[PDB]
Design a protein around this motif. Sequence first.
Motif, PDB file in Angstrom:
ATOM      1  N   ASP A 100      -8.730  -5.283  10.568  1.00  0.00           N
ATOM      2  CA  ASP A 100      -9.682  -4.630   9.286  1.00  0.00           C
ATOM      3  C   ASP A 100      -8.559  -3.204   9.916  1.00  0.00           C
ATOM      4  N   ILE A 101      -6.934  -3.581   9.857  1.00  0.00           N
ATOM      5  CA  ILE A 101      -5.640  -2.440  10.059  1.00  0.00           C
ATOM      6  C   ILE A 101      -4.548  -2.619   9.763  1.00  0.00           C
ATOM      7  N   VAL A 102      -3.987  -1.629   9.075  1.00  0.00           N
ATOM      8  CA  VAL A 102      -3.149  -1.835   7.316  1.00  0.00           C
ATOM      9  C   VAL A 102      -1.502  -1.768   8.978  1.00  0.00           C
ATOM     10  N   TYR A 103      -0.825  -2.707   8.807  1.00  0.00           N
ATOM     11  CA  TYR A 103       0.353  -3.537   9.081  1.00  0.00           C
ATOM     12  C   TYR A 103       1.619  -3.368   7.936  1.00  0.00           C
ATOM     13  N   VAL A 104       2.496  -2.901   8.170  1.00  0.00           N
ATOM     14  CA  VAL A 104       3.591  -2.779   7.144  1.00  0.00           C
ATOM     15  C   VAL A 104       4.685  -3.616   7.671  1.00  0.00           C
ATOM     16  N   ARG A 105       4.446  -4.634   6.956  1.00  0.00           N
ATOM     17  CA  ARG A 105       4.997  -5.630   6.863  1.00  0.00           C
ATOM     18  C   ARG A 105       6.380  -5.304   6.096  1.00  0.00           C
ATOM     19  N   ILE A 106       7.572  -5.173   6.605  1.00  0.00           N
ATOM     20  CA  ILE A 106       8.740  -4.575   5.671  1.00  0.00           C
ATOM     21  C   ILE A 106       9.353  -5.991   5.338  1.00  0.00           C
ATOM     22  N   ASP A 107       9.801  -6.029   4.499  1.00  0.00           N
ATOM     23  CA  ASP A 107      10.419  -6.920   3.606  1.00  0.00           C
ATOM     24  C   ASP A 107       9.798  -8.829   4.139  1.00  0.00           C
TER      25      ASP A 107
END
Length: 52
Positions: A41-48
Amino acid sequence: SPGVFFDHDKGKTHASGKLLFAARVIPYRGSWLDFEFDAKDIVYVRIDRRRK
DNA sequence: CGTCGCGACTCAGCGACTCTTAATCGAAGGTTAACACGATGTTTCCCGCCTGTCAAGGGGCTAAGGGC
């Protein structure tokens, strides 16, 4: 089309049955961004889609 | 008579090979300092040796005609 997208996962790649709700903004010319969640339940900024 | 000092533990996580089987038609676009001897091939004729004509001459073999 360029713009932010919120592709709610259909159970695949989930912990047990939870959804992901990968908030991804697709640019017209550049690098993609992914703000998907995980089982923790955590937002991860998976860039590209390179790292999380 | 509790915990923590100190140890494994399996859990996650992260990377990663294929897309049937024959077939519908052949190639496919950019990159833009200047000069100099030298040693190194490249290309032409030029005679050397030799190869290939046809001919000339001749003889030797084969055969055909004439005479006894």
